[PDB]
Design a protein around this ligand. Sequence first.
Ligand SMILES: CNC(=O)O[C@@H](CC(C)C)c1nc([C@H]2OC(=O)/C(C)=C/C/C(C)=C/[C@@H](O)[C@@H](C)\C=C(C)/C=C(C)\C=C\[C@@H](O)[C@H](C)[C@H](OC)/C(C)=C/C=C/[C@@H]2C)cs1
Ligand SMILES: CNC(=O)O[C@@H](CC(C)C)c1nc([C@H]2OC(=O)/C(C)=C/C/C(C)=C/[C@@H](O)[C@@H](C)\C=C(C)/C=C(C)\C=C\[C@@H](O)[C@H](C)[C@H](OC)/C(C)=C/C=C/[C@@H]2C)cs1
Ligand SMILES: CNC(=O)O[C@@H](CC(C)C)c1nc([C@H]2OC(=O)/C(C)=C/C/C(C)=C/[C@@H](O)[C@@H](C)\C=C(C)/C=C(C)\C=C\[C@@H](O)[C@H](C)[C@H](OC)/C(C)=C/C=C/[C@@H]2C)cs1
Ligand SMILES: CNC(=O)O[C@@H](CC(C)C)c1nc([C@H]2OC(=O)/C(C)=C/C/C(C)=C/[C@@H](O)[C@@H](C)\C=C(C)/C=C(C)\C=C\[C@@H](O)[C@H](C)[C@H](OC)/C(C)=C/C=C/[C@@H]2C)cs1
Ligand SMILES: CNC(=O)O[C@@H](CC(C)C)c1nc([C@H]2OC(=O)/C(C)=C/C/C(C)=C/[C@@H](O)[C@@H](C)\C=C(C)/C=C(C)\C=C\[C@@H](O)[C@H](C)[C@H](OC)/C(C)=C/C=C/[C@@H]2C)cs1
Lengths: 51, 53, 148, 159, 159, 159, 159, 159, 36, 345, 198, 158
Amino acid sequence: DILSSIWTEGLLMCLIVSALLLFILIVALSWISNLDITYGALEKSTNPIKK
Amino acid sequence: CIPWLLLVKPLHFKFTEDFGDIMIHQVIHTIEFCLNCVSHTASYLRLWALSLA
Amino acid sequence: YGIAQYREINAGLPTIVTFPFMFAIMFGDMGHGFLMTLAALSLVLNEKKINKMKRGEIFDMAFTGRYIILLMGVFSMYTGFLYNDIFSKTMTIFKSGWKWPDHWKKGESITATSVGTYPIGLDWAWHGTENALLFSNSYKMKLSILMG
Amino acid sequence: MTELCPVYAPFFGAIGCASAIIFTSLGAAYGTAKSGVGICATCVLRPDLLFKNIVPVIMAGIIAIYGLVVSVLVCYSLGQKQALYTGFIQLGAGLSVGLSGLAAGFAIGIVGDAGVRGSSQQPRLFVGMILILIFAEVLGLYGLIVALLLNSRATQDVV
Amino acid sequence: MTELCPVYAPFFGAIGCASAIIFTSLGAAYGTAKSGVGICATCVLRPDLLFKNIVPVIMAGIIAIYGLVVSVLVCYSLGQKQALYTGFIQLGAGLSVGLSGLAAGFAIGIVGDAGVRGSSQQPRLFVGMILILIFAEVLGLYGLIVALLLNSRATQDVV
Amino acid sequence: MTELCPVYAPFFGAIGCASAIIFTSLGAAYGTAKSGVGICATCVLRPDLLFKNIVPVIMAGIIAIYGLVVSVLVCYSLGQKQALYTGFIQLGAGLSVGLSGLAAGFAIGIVGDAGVRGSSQQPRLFVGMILILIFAEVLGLYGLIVALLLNSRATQDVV
Amino acid sequence: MTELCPVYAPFFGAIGCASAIIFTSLGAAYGTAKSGVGICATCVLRPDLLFKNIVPVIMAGIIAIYGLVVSVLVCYSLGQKQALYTGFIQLGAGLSVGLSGLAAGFAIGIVGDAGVRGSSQQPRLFVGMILILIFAEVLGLYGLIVALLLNSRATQDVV
Amino acid sequence: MTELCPVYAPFFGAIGCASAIIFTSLGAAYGTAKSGVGICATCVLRPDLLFKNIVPVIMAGIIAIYGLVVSVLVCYSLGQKQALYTGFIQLGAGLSVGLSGLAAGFAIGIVGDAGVRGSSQQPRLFVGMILILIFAEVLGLYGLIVALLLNSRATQDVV
Amino acid sequence: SAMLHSLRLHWVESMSKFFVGEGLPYEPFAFEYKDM
Amino acid sequence: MEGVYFNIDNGFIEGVVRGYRNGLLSNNQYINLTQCDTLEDLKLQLSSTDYGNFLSSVSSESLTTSLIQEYASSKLYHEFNYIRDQSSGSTRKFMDYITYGYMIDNVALMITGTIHDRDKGEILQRCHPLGWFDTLPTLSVATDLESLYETVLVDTPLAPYFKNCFDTAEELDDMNIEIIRNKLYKAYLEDFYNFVTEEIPEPAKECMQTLLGFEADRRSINIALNSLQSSDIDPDLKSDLLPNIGKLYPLATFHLAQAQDFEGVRAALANVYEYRGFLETGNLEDHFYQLEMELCRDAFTQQFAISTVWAWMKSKEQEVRNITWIAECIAQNQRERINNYISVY
Amino acid sequence: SFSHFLYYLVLIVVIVYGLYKLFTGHGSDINFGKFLLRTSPYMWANLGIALCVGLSVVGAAWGIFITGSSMIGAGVRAPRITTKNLISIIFCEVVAIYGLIIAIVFSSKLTVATAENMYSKSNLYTGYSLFWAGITVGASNLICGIAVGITGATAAISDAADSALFVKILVIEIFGSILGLLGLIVGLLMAGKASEFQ
Amino acid sequence: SNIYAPLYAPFFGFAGCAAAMVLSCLGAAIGTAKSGIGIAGIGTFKPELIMKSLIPVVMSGILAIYGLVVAVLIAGNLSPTEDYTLFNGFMHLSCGLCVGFACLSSGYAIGMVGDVGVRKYMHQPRLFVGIVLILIFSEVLGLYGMIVALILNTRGSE
Ligand SMILES: CNC(=O)O[C@@H](CC(C)C)c1nc([C@H]2OC(=O)/C(C)=C/C/C(C)=C/[C@@H](O)[C@@H](C)\C=C(C)/C=C(C)\C=C\[C@@H](O)[C@H](C)[C@H](OC)/C(C)=C/C=C/[C@@H]2C)cs1
Ligand SMILES: CNC(=O)O[C@@H](CC(C)C)c1nc([C@H]2OC(=O)/C(C)=C/C/C(C)=C/[C@@H](O)[C@@H](C)\C=C(C)/C=C(C)\C=C\[C@@H](O)[C@H](C)[C@H](OC)/C(C)=C/C=C/[C@@H]2C)cs1
Ligand SMILES: CNC(=O)O[C@@H](CC(C)C)c1nc([C@H]2OC(=O)/C(C)=C/C/C(C)=C/[C@@H](O)[C@@H](C)\C=C(C)/C=C(C)\C=C\[C@@H](O)[C@H](C)[C@H](OC)/C(C)=C/C=C/[C@@H]2C)cs1
Ligand SMILES: CNC(=O)O[C@@H](CC(C)C)c1nc([C@H]2OC(=O)/C(C)=C/C/C(C)=C/[C@@H](O)[C@@H](C)\C=C(C)/C=C(C)\C=C\[C@@H](O)[C@H](C)[C@H](OC)/C(C)=C/C=C/[C@@H]2C)cs1
Ligand SMILES: CNC(=O)O[C@@H](CC(C)C)c1nc([C@H]2OC(=O)/C(C)=C/C/C(C)=C/[C@@H](O)[C@@H](C)\C=C(C)/C=C(C)\C=C\[C@@H](O)[C@H](C)[C@H](OC)/C(C)=C/C=C/[C@@H]2C)cs1
């Protein structure tokens, strides 16, 4: 009455835990990759009319 | 007491359009107070949380 | 937060004590409390000189609340004494209310028996004990609920 | 390998020791990066605020400290023959601290950036930012705490 | 193949030896690339700062030194008949240094780019960037540490 | 559990009770939302048309009434020991009415938005919108007919 | 459950009965929606054309008639103990008609929108749109012919 | 169910009968839609070309006839006890024809749109579009042919 | 952190109970050194 | 939803922009300005607004309507450029897109001055600062578009918008400048509409589509009415100037392209119901400005939208105009038309 | 899209595997029931407790950033709102404290079961109950926090626009802040009849 | 013991509970958040219209009451010492799906209608009544998922 020889309950538990973790990591890395530096405050203006 | 807090003061004002404002304020205050008892009792567990940490 | 209504109960008078003591509950360590007390005393005892000179925004805020921090440190010392926590360690001033078994072997799980109640503060018997956290959590949850 | 203590039980606890630091260091890095971007944008105009707009970058690091604490506590409860219950508890304790720290960091960053950008204009806002930041930080704390509680059960009454 | 030491246990160890250096190098490359872009953008105007805006590229490379410290240590504890617990510990240690050094490198790159861009205008900002960068570079350290303190348990008390 | 009536047969019929109401409400909500957006955009200029540009919201609602008619008919034919054929029939009826109502509700929403926006300018367009909306509504009725003609076979001649 | 007639054979007949009306309604809804958008855009200027630019919405509705015909015929041939071959045939007929109607309806929506928009300017174009729309309808009729020729074999010569 | 003729062999043939008409209709619908959009855009200026810019729609239609030729042939060769080899052959023929027709219909739509748009300006371009459309249409033919030459082997020399 | 969670327990949990607020701050007309 | 991801980058931007909005002069403040008897009184009254001490460095004798306009506009542009200095990613691209129109306007002002031999200093003073690019003063060297593009505008963000301006003759004059300026605003508006549709999320995608459709419609109507004055222009050439993103497109824009008289424009606008009475009576410019203010007000009812940066810049830009107008009626003493200050907030 | 392509590939692989097992007579080999029965209830309980706390925190943090970022922007010109709208940030942080509370209550049921009484009716029920109650509390608190933060940002901007507006938007927050409470309640009802693992 | 009541059947009943509560809360939060963004937007113009414009948030909350009721009913029928059929668990999984997704749809429609009407009837005060009608129609969508859920509970226990 085993679930499977390859996909044992322990292996499936490990895999679903790792999948939850990898999904979280993917979300976090997507969010971090969306980090865009606000350059406008980092470069100097060059406008004679103003600034 | 929930009906008490909700009704006694606005009804006293009615019996002596402003009554509408009084009733609205009393309803908001009662909901806020009833939720705040629980949310304030749970919040003071931050004392334990920060002490433990 | 806001300006009190005219002739309304002022929240500063009660905060003088309640804001430092609620902090102390959240802090509860005689070591850190003593360090903070000394930091506040440095400003308080030299309050005239610091007032005369110019101060930065953060330093100005710290100096203005110098008595705040003094009270926070004193109450933190008191609470840490009640928590028996000095730099994460415990003091053994009083006889403990727990007696460990007369004899045991190395690595043997031993449980203590209640022979009394610690006079002031948490008994040092459950320092470094496996279940210490279970008692500390219960006590401090209930303490926070009651105080709040 | 016992019924209650399979050979794969240490898998979950080691993934929890890792998850705690990896996700509290993801959140802390996000917070530090965004707060530093804000600090670099503001201190061009207002360098005098720099050693006082560092607070968000100090709070994000405290998130990483909360998961270095849960990781080190979970790593010393890890064993070759430690029960599957202990492994699940250690995974849960790292999932909690790591995710809560990620959320707290992500919020610390977004809120520190806003508050440093606005404090260069309204100094009175510094108090507002620090108060909104102490509530983003407490989230992480709440994770650590849960994690800590989890570890208080991980190895106890376990066969 | 023993119950406790299957033939596939070295898989996780070898995946950790890989992951540590892999993710630390990814983070270090990200940081070096962005910091170098900032340095090239600034030193066009301010070459005199170049040999002093190289700090983020140094701090990003300490992330890869941390991943090489864990890969080299995980590698010397890799064995044909090493326990599955040891393999899981060696995977957690690599993921800890690797994914905490990825985050630190991302933070280092962003902060260094911002700080080199702003330091060409406000020199006093360079010290703020160095503090913000020590807080980012700290994250990676923590992962190394949790990864070290996981190798201290990898082979020990293991049958 | 019989060969023909496994314990998991009620799963499919239950997914059909859900599919009927999950999708007919999704379509009806889409239609009601877009038609209401159009009505709010138009009635700012033409409030007198309001009670009469409500037709697309009434039409989108009959899409949800169609999946309530199938969900309630499918739910009164469900059973602990009901055949797998009956379960598949009840899943196919719920899918039929739910999908056909989703499509009809999408068409109803788009057409109603367009027709309310255009009817505030050309009143003669209203009858044209009603007809194009009757054609879109019709698609949900065809799904209800196939779902109702599937329940006529769900429990019948079944062992 | 026979070798040739498993308990799960009715699964593919019901999915084909559902697919027959689910995809034909999706295509018809797409066509009706886009044609109605075009009709509402044009009839603001040219209401007199409305009861004659409704053709794409009538042509996109014959797509759903094609899936009601196959859904109704596939469903009266469904059975608890009907062969797996019959189930596969009823799935292939429902896929054939639904997919072919989906494509037809998409073409009928795009072409009808374009032709109603252009016919308000060039009336001679209406005949061209009706022709391109007859071609789009044949794509659906061809799927109905394949689906109707698949059901002619579904239950026949089947044990 | 024989070794060579499982009960699931008809599954492939039915997916092939459906795939042949499903993808050839998808391609034909794409081609008809885009060519009709082009025809509606051009015939506003040049209605006289309309009954002669219909060629791409007539060419995209032939893509669907090719899928109907393969679907009707694949279906008359479907059987309850037909070999798995025959099922794979009927799936391969249906895939062949449908995919080639999809590609041919996409090419036909794009080329026909471009050529009708350009022919309203340069009539001499019409012959070039028919030449490029003959080439796009022969991509579908070559699928049909491969499909045909796959059905010539589907039922033959099969036990 | 603990100083600022004490502030919320005072501003939100303590002063929510009795503090009406919305008063007029006392800013009497006084001369003060104004720095350029 | 709009709120979930909007505040990760644009929360502070929207808060500050909405704070700027709250400072928009209301009708009562405009009336108070109207009652001012002098530019000194106008400055004092404006000091009570969020303009504040913006003229505090200006002496009494130096107060002029031109100076007041310059200072208010400089305040607006400094606010805009700061908000850009706090924005990143898609928002930076959006705010850069807002500047590309001012750049097209400056390119025409610069080249129009170069062909009239006017001093480059005055021509550059009159140029819109938001529309500044490093090589803008270098447009004061050449006359033919070929040299100007191959030497200056290829490196500018306006380069993609030079794909239909090469047809005209090498010799360049005022009519050719107007043609080039309309072609550059057609290509720009189409590019800014595409950028909004693909990258700018909803409901700032819809708000910015509506506000660019209005811009395109106004440009088309103005182009048609200006071509009316000219003896005749090829309708195909006109169609190359009318943007293809507005409510007018493709029917009303077409009819305007082939329109050859004022009644033709009126017939073209009759079909579209949003511009019915614009040409019926009144001042067309005032009608357009009122519609723009109404559209911007509507963009402020939608939070978690970067359409509010555009709606604040165009609202504030109207405010400045209004102030200038009032200032004129105070400086020149013609107070009969002082109340035509178009107020919506 | 790479993500959409991966989703489609996973769906196709799952469908093909299911059809292969079903046709070959091994449809029952994909036994979700056996997976649930044999997977340790400890995993379900601990995942529930971790996801409860984590998702409650995620929503709290997500709301705090939405409210916090809009308060800071609006307080540049109207700093008076900073303390007034801070109640919004307390409605966002209160969901987290609910999750924490639930974790504490649910962690009390994380006892150690005996080897024989491990996959029993009570222990499997306790695992499912604490997994799904934690999921419910965490997701409800996530939604409530993100929604209350979106309302708090609107309230902060309105307060900056006009003070009188705030009290009217706070009501909406009070409407949203209850949604986590309900989840909390429902969680307590799910894990109500659950018992410590025995 | 009972093959028709396997020990994993409570997993499905608790999945239904979670679906009900979480998805109804998601609808009520999409409704109260999106409708609330419409009430704050108008606040800058017609602050006086905000208190009457709370019908959309009140209606969105009733969607999380439809899911609380269903979840409470499902949880009252789940016990570790009671024989829960796998049929009762499927029937409580559909209850959850039925109420949660119906309330999600109702909440999306209520957020979309409330937001735009509130932001729209600033100019036209007569539009408001219509909003209340449309908001009713959307709200009914959730009710229907509740009702079907109730019927599915009455049949799961029986
Ligand atoms: C990918 N390229 C790469 O590998 O670069 C190679 C060079 C190649 C081009 C050949 C590198 N050589 C180095 C050498 O040091 C340096 O230049 C400098 C200035 C080091 C001083 C710095 C910046 C110190 C910061 O960390 C501190 C304040 C950060 C933290 C958190 C605080 C602590 C207590 C952590 C300390 C550890 O970080 C420690 C320092 C690290 O322990 C493993 C270590 C001993 C790295 C190797 C450094 C060499 C000597 C760095 S990079
Ligand atoms: C989203 N909230 C929601 O659920 O709304 C609920 C609750 C509300 C009170 C809030 C609704 N109650 C109703 C009631 O009717 C009406 O107002 C009106 C005017 C109905 C007439 C209409 C428009 C008929 C069109 O379909 C026709 C031409 C379309 C087609 C294709 C032709 C046929 C032969 C189809 C007929 C079926 O459509 C039939 C009619 C339907 O059979 C199931 C039915 C009896 C629905 C319930 C109607 C009630 C009385 C509508 S909405
Ligand atoms: C979107 N909702 C929806 O479902 O609407 C429903 C319900 C409505 C009452 C609301 C619809 N009822 C109808 C009714 O007919 C009509 O009005 C008209 C004018 C039909 C004539 C048309 C246009 C014929 C075109 O196809 C021809 C030239 C196309 C092709 C390729 C050539 C051939 C040989 C194909 C023929 C089949 O197509 C045949 C025609 C179809 O065989 C199944 C059939 C007899 C449908 C029933 C139509 C009814 C009478 C249409 S739509
Ligand atoms: C939408 N779906 C659909 O079916 O529309 C129906 C619409 C009606 C039901 C209303 C259609 N009826 C037709 C009829 O053809 C025509 O008018 C004409 C003049 C077709 C001539 C064309 C253009 C031939 C091109 O292919 C040639 C040059 C391309 C190539 C590479 C060369 C070769 C050797 C390929 C030949 C095959 O293409 C062959 C021809 C095809 O063999 C299967 C066939 C006999 C199709 C049916 C045609 C009918 C008579 C087309 S569309
Ligand atoms: C956030 N989550 C949450 O808990 O909300 C709490 C939050 C607050 C404590 C702050 C809420 N308390 C309430 C209370 O109601 C009200 O104020 C008002 C005015 C209710 C009248 C309304 C608008 C009725 C509409 O539905 C009608 C026209 C819609 C339809 C389709 C038709 C019918 C026949 C309605 C059937 C059910 O809808 C029924 C009415 C509902 O049965 C379950 C019910 C009795 C809910 C609870 C209401 C309380 C008293 C609402 S929100």
